[PDB]
Amino acid sequence: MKLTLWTYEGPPHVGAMRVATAMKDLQLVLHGPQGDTYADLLFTMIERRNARPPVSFSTFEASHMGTDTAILLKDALAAAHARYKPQAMAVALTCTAELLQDDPNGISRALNLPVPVVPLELPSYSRKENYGADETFRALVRALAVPMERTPEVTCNLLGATALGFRHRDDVAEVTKLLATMGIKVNVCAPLGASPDDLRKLGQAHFNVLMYPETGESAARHLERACKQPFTKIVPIGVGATRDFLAEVSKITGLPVVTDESTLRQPWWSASVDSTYLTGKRVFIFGDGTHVIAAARIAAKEVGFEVVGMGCYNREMARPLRTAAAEYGLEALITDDYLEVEKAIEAAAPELILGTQMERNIAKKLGLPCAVISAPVHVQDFPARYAPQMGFEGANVLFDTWVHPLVMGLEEHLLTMF
Amino acid sequence: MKLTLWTYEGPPHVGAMRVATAMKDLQLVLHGPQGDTYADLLFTMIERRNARPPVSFSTFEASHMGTDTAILLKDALAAAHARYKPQAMAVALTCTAELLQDDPNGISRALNLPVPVVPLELPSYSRKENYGADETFRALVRALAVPMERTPEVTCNLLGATALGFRHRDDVAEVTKLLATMGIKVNVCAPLGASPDDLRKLGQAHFNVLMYPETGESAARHLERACKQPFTKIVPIGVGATRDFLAEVSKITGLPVVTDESTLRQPWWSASVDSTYLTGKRVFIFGDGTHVIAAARIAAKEVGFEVVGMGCYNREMARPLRTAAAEYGLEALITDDYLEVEKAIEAAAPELILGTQMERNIAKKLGLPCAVISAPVHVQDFPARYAPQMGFEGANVLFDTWVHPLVMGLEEHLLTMF
Amino acid sequence: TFGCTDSPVRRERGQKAVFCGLTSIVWLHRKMQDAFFLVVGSRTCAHLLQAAAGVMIFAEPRFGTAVLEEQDLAGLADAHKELDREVAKLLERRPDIRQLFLVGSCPSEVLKLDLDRAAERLSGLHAPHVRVYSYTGSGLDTTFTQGEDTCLAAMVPTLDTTEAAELIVVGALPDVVEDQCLSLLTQLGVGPVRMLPARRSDIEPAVGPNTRFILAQPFLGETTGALERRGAKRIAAPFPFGEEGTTLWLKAVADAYGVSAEKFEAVTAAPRARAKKAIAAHLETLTGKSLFMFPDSQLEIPLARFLARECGMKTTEIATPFLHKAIMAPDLALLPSNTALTEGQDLEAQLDRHEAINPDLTVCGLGLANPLEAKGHATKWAIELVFTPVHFYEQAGDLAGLFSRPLRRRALLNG
Amino acid sequence: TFGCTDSPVRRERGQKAVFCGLTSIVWLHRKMQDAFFLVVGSRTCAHLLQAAAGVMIFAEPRFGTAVLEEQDLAGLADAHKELDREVAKLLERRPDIRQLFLVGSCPSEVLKLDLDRAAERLSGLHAPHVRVYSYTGSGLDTTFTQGEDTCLAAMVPTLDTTEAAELIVVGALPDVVEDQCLSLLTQLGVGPVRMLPARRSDIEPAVGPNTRFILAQPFLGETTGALERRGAKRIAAPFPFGEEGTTLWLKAVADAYGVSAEKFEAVTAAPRARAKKAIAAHLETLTGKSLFMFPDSQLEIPLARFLARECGMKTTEIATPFLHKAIMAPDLALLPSNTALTEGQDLEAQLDRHEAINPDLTVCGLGLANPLEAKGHATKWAIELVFTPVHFYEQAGDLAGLFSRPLRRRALLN
Numbered sequence A, B: 001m002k003l004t005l006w007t008y009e010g011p012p013h014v015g016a017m018r019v020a021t022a023m024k025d026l027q028l029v030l031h032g033p034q035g036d037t038y039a040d041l042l043f044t045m046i047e048r049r050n051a052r053p054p055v056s057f058s059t060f061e062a063s064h065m066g067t068d069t070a071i072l073l074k075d076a077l078a079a080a081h082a083r084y085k086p087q088a089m090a091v092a093l094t095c096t097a098e099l100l101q102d103d104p105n106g107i108s109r110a111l112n113l114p115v116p117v118v119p120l121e122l123p124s125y126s127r128k129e130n131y132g133a134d135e136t137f138r139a140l141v142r143a144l145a146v147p148m149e150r151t152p153e154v155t156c157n158l159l160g161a162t163a164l165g166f167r168h169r170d171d172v173a174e175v176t177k178l179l180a181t182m183g184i185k186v187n188v189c190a191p192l193g194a195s196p197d198d199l200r201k202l203g204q205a206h207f208n209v210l211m212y213p214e215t216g217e218s219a220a221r222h223l224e225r226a227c228k229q230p231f232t233k234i235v236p237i238g239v240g241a242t243r244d245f246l247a248e249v250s251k252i253t254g255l256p257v258v259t260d261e262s263t264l265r266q267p268w269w270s271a272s273v274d275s276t277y278l279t280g281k282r283v284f285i286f287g288d289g290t291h292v293i294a295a296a297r298i299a300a301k302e303v304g305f306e307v308v309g310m311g312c313y314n315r316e317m318a319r320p321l322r323t324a325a326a327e328y329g330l331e332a333l334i335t336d337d338y339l340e341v342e343k344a345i346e347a348a349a350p351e352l353i354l355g356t357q358m359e360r361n362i363a364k365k366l367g368l369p370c371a372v373i374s375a376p377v378h379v380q381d382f383p384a385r386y387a388p389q390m391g392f393e394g395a396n397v398l399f400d401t402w403v404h405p406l407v408m409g410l411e412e413h414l415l416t417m418f
Numbered sequence C: 001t002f003g004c005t006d007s008p009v010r011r012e013r014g015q016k017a018v019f020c021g022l023t024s025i026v027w028l029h030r031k032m033q034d035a036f037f038l039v040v041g042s043r044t045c046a047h048l049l050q051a052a053a054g055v056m057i058f059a060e061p062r063f064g065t066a067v068l069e070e071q072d073l074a075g076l077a078d079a080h081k082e083l084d085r086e087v088a089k090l091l092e093r094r095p096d097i098r099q100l101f102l103v104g105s106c107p108s109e110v111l112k113l114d115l116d117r118a119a120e121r122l123s124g125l126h127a128p129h130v131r132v133y134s135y136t137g138s139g140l141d142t143t144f145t146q147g148e149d150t151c152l153a154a155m156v157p158t159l160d161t162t163e164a165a166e167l168i169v170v171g172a173l174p175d176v177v178e179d180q181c182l183s184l185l186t187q188l189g190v191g192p193v194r195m196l197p198a199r200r201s202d203i204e205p206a207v208g209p210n211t212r213f214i215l216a217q218p219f220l221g222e223t224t225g226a227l228e229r230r231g232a233k234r235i236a237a238p239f240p241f242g243e244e245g246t247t248l249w250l251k252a253v254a255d256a257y258g259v260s261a262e263k264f265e266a267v268t269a270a271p272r273a274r275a276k277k278a279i280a281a282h283l284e285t286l287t288g289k290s291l292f293m294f295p296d297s298q299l300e301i302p303l304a305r306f307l308a309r310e311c312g313m314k315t316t317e318i319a320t321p322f323l324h325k326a327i328m329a330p331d332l333a334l335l336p337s338n339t340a341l342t343e344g345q346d347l348e349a350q351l352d353r354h355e356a357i358n359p360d361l362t363v364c365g366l367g368l369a370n371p372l373e374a375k376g377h378a379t380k381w382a383i384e385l386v387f388t389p390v391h392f393y394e395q396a397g398d399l400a401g402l403f404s405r406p407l408r409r410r411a412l413l414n415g
Numbered sequence D: 001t002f003g004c005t006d007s008p009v010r011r012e013r014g015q016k017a018v019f020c021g022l023t024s025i026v027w028l029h030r031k032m033q034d035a036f037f038l039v040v041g042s043r044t045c046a047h048l049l050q051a052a053a054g055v056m057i058f059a060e061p062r063f064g065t066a067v068l069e070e071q072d073l074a075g076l077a078d079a080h081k082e083l084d085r086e087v088a089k090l091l092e093r094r095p096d097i098r099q100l101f102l103v104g105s106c107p108s109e110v111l112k113l114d115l116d117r118a119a120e121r122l123s124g125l126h127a128p129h130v131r132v133y134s135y136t137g138s139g140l141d142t143t144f145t146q147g148e149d150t151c152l153a154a155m156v157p158t159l160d161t162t163e164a165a166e167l168i169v170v171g172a173l174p175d176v177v178e179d180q181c182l183s184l185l186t187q188l189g190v191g192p193v194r195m196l197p198a199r200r201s202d203i204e205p206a207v208g209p210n211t212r213f214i215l216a217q218p219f220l221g222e223t224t225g226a227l228e229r230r231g232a233k234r235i236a237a238p239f240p241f242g243e244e245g246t247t248l249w250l251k252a253v254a255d256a257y258g259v260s261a262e263k264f265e266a267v268t269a270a271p272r273a274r275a276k277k278a279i280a281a282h283l284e285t286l287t288g289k290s291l292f293m294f295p296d297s298q299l300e301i302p303l304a305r306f307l308a309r310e311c312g313m314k315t316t317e318i319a320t321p322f323l324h325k326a327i328m329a330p331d332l333a334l335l336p337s338n339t340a341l342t343e344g345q346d347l348e349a350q351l352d353r354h355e356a357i358n359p360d361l362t363v364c365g366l367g368l369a370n371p372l373e374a375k376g377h378a379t380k381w382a383i384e385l386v387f388t389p390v391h392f393y394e395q396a397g398d399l400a401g402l403f404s405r406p407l408r409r410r411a412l413l414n
């Protein structure tokens, strides 16, 4: 047992929910107790979606346990299909249902529905939300994706964008712009916006843009084996990383890198004398691996901060984070325990924290400037306005976001000699 | 004499600098003392410009007064023309030079330069910055714009955008998108981005879009007489005002309104259940007339706030503001005195303040939530990121912006009973 | 025209969209100052509490989850000495905790962790400084507010005995509401009066064969049963919502304690006119409007009764997760007789009925609210009714305002 | 190899890019607690002060502008009556003001408003509670820091008389710097030492025929003259910037007060070593780098001297708004022989020389800084040198750091 107050990630069944909710025409059925529908509110309230998530629970409770639990699951699968007529379905267990001995694969096969029902294996006691998403998406791609002739024009798939993803909406929009300027169109963006039938047509793309390793890595590897599609290893967050990404895409496709830099303003903002006070400001960085790695490079090489701590809560990204941290002369903090993040922050004594909503509150407690760079996030970090982290507009956004919490040059000079 | 600590607007010659610096290939020469170049820093630091403003000062000082001051202005005009070879020039008087006897029109005519030198009448002891810009741009349009043949395609001019304008950069971009969607291209955007030669070909546009009345109203009225071009009276800040703007443009051109609302998220954000606690929040609104009129409509009709105060610092917009304020059952507060603004705020005890940088500081002392809607503004309100106030993305930006300072629904319910 | 005593109630089951009783910890921990709530459950249960708590989670709250690891699931794994280690460690650094609640969850129950046994073992090990209790807040057993019921009920067998004839007011109320209630009953000459739960562990009420108790919240069936086992007698009353609800609730206590009609009417006249006037500010927007309530909390029947009788609303279907018939009898006798009553839920069938009714205002949870708004249905999110001072005279206007607000926002934003 | 004593300085007029002396109020009002600074000028002057002040303008500062209205622009006798009414109204509201400075501007001076006489008549009216002074901060008369000089000089005739042989340290210094200065001098056995300006109006130094003064700031030509007029005698010294400048400054005081060589060495030894160590951390980026200074404040010569001698920098052109020969002598004698010296400015000509030189680091104002950066020239904005503690030993590394920082950022970002 572990005494727990805050968790960076939910159970893996929430990751499954955010693949299903990202997609259209797919119904996810979770074998779970009455009460677990609380997770629907994540989508309707934080992301403020205008429809109920395409997820239903078998809803077992004290008066229908034992042999009834298997029946409730059967009914839930049947009722979801009859009502919604999805192109495909997924079935999975909640943490409580994992302690039961019902077989969702055998139950779903005996029902013999006219569409695919993809069973999911989500270990709730050892794995978490991000794995849930990655494995659900992988299981669905392995069930539906098929070798095809390439599109006549150079196209890619976008992989890894989900419901409840930090700036997934606008990152998709911004990355699509980056590729279009190079004459590359998107075939399928998945899971976000995609149907099961779209997943069937994934193989006609020339390559894949792996937007978020935590939610797309496994499906990217399968598509590389099944569809012989290279996938990008560089995540275009930051000006440098966006350039490396485009050079990577160029190597994959043989197309020249073309950019539209008419609204790229971050480099000049950072080069201007307004920003010289930012030099050597000590920054602690925490969140998921993808966003922490990206932030550290921007911090050190684009904004001129001294990176004084780097860590992530998802140990699936521990390898690349350890590799990244070493470039800064740092050992990576790999932990899901916020108290250990708090200790590390206090020890590093930074001037700025870049992290999660939890680090926002640690920073408040310590009286320290903080900006959000990563999920978990509250409703404010699901904005109405265009707010990408990726590409050139994302660099603009990130500059404004990070310098905001910091008192300015003049103020600093008045708070020392006066 | 009038005891002054804070001033909302600078002197009229700073407005002249806003027009000249907005433009390309125009040199402004100001007859003024050594020291008045401080205003250069507004453009290099706040607006963060990568070049010296196209503005030079005659630089008179105590040891070189009398008959030398006239010589110095002559030398300043000659030197500016010989060095920069501009398509046109402007010449005006600083507040100090107004007290001198030198004739800028007479001096410039006696130099007989190969390009037009447009003298400006800027009364520094009765008028302010906005008038200076409105007048400077008018004088330039009067000197350069001629009757023409209309473009075969429906085109318009954008009028009033300047250097040091609050979100002028992105408003220009957003209004352009709105017009392109209707099939209307921009002829010339002026002053911002325009050269004296661009001003000569203003006549060929079918109509004018008056973006900012305080900086473009006079040139709009001239072009209606001289070039028979109607100008828009509705400023597209807010969803409703944008729709009214598009319908207005529709009557002028005969073209049907076509909108791309695939990215308009403010209405749903505002309609969503997260936003219900916003109903009846008492808002006090101050700034320039244009932005205060626009903010009050959004506040009341789009967000659901109760507007408890409305005012502007610029007397040129006093009548339109009084008219607008009466619709809310309010008396418009017309004042350039921040102490009066502070008192009116205190008497209204609002829950939110929408204003300028001064209102942000009034709000801080009073411990009240505040968002910025109008110049004068600090460097932060000249962002690297896309941040229009106009059009559909403007509505998104404005929703996020005004809601941010407010304590959220849940935290409110904790006040309260715990 | 009024009276649903003999109305057939639809007993419906199937897919439900409700909270488990764990969510009750969110408000319970604020009321009960020296208590700690330790859920024994999974990351799912900690995830729920964190999501529910929002800002509170960062204010070092008096709750936590002992999350089960893979190792705790094993048939030789001594999860009980693991649990004892967990609480010993928790209490070691927290000498402020005088009451520890071991809260059961779906995983702990399916696993068959005997938390009752653990509570007795642990309160023996940690006497006399901390008493430890056990109750279920699992989705298997409880819905939302029922977690308050199972909590209070667990405390009852432990309460001091007394021969005293005192009043217990049952239900965790906001401090301001509790003070007003306590003031009004003192003004009527009834006393002394105590609350279950109390603000601190050392001032809990005693119980005995002469104890009277009245419920301030409808969801307190198990606590009612537990008190009655100690010999205490209940005062039946409509719930203190609105001017009428509050008068009837007060009158029941007044009648119980032999309070004269003169004194009741004199203490009560000014607060009553004040409440009735505060409600009238919301009548123009609320009158004639049809009402639909999804099940969440058991406040549906008494709140529907207040909205029809005092606000001129028209009931359609009023649904509740559980309908305790004896406890709800007074409110049911006052509900408009046209009202379709539902206990439980089959979500899709119930949404189908909702759709065909097309009601003006729908009370529902946060999972349904935005989806329903998007289909053109004005909603009032149900959680607010547990998270706002709404009981008694002073809050009667505010209560009406909770329902008029979404309707006024809709008008204000659509012209 | 070292010594610019006889270097011909290029004296230059034309287009200038400098601040007027009004800007001095921004730091003066912070040091001078009892004081109010009332500019008599236009909206231009008010606009300058608020843009300059930044966050200070919202911190309820002890300054303001009586902005000239149209009626004030004609009729001198009536304008003087209006000023008095405006001052009476300000003072009536503000009993906390003990010192009122009427500050001259370009508009007030072209109007020929005799503020010197207004101060005289207002002092007579509002005595003994409020003393009112007059000084010019106009762009016609002053550049940036010279506003401090005209301010302090205005106070001097009115200072109390004394026959005591006390030391006055002249210049408004950050409180930490001032405290270190008092400490070092007390350790050296020199006292009583007072500061001009003082922190309060009731503790200003007295002056007489036995007073000694030393300048902490190079721009104090007028104040020097006024003190000398009262019989005070100046102690010549390089300016206390860096380890060497500070030592040479303290040594001049020590020698003037007959302090032993052993006493000087024992008090100064540790802070000297600590300063040299703090500076050493910045030597790798700074050594061998060419330095160019646009004119702003009169700190240019002493700072060029510090950067060459202690930080290994190569001087190119070092420009100053005004060069007081006698006051700048000690620093000029230490400045490297190659240095091209300029007094004044012809902006475009100077900018052409700048481009031809292609210097590694350029010190310049905020109007020039960004445009120069965009041309590939690393800059160090000049205002910071007046808004950072930079004098004496404890700040010697910090001062070097001010110049290493923009070069370190440039390297860091590419």
Ligand code: PMR
Pocket: A273, A274, A275, A277, A408, A409, A410, A411, A413, B038, B039, B041, B042, B043, B045, B046, B379, D019, D023, D024, D026, D027, D047, D048, D051, D052, D053, D054, D366, D381, D383, D384, D387
């Ligand atoms: C009067 C024009 C003007 C403008 C537009 C700015 C902007 C500005 N001045 Mg400021 N500044 C002006 C003048 C002055 N500044 C002054 C001071 C000052 C300092 C010490 C600093 C500063 C700064 C700024 C800044 C940066 C943002 C800020 O710190 O407020 C702006 C926009 C800021 C900086 O980063 O410079 C590189 C900083 O540390 N200003 C002074 C001292 C008398 C003056 C006269």
Ligand code: PMR
Pocket: A038, A039, A041, A042, A045, A046, A379, B273, B274, B275, B277, B408, B409, B410, B411, B413, C019, C023, C024, C026, C027, C048, C051, C052, C053, C054, C366, C381, C383, C384, C387
């Ligand atoms: C368990 C899931 C969950 C989620 C994702 C939210 C989000 C959210 N809940 Mg919350 N809320 C959840 C549950 C609960 N909320 C609860 C309380 C609550 C309140 C009182 C309020 C609220 C709200 C919210 C909000 C709006 C933003 C905020 O107020 O922080 C989110 C995103 C907020 C609102 O505007 O509702 C319409 C508000 O006033 N929640 C409670 C009480 C036990 C629970 C169980």
Ligand code: SF4
Pocket: A033, A034, A035, A036, A096, C020, C021, C022, C041, C042, C044, C045, C046, C048, C104, C105, C106, C107, C137, C138, C139, C140
């Ligand atoms: S319904 Fe059960 S598993 Fe889900 S959070 Fe509640 S107690 Fe935990």
Ligand code: SF4
Pocket: B033, B034, B035, B036, B096, D020, D021, D022, D041, D042, D044, D045, D046, D048, D104, D105, D106, D107, D137, D138, D139, D140
């Ligand atoms: S004193 Fe002269 S140079 Fe300074 S702001 Fe006023 S007018 Fe300009």
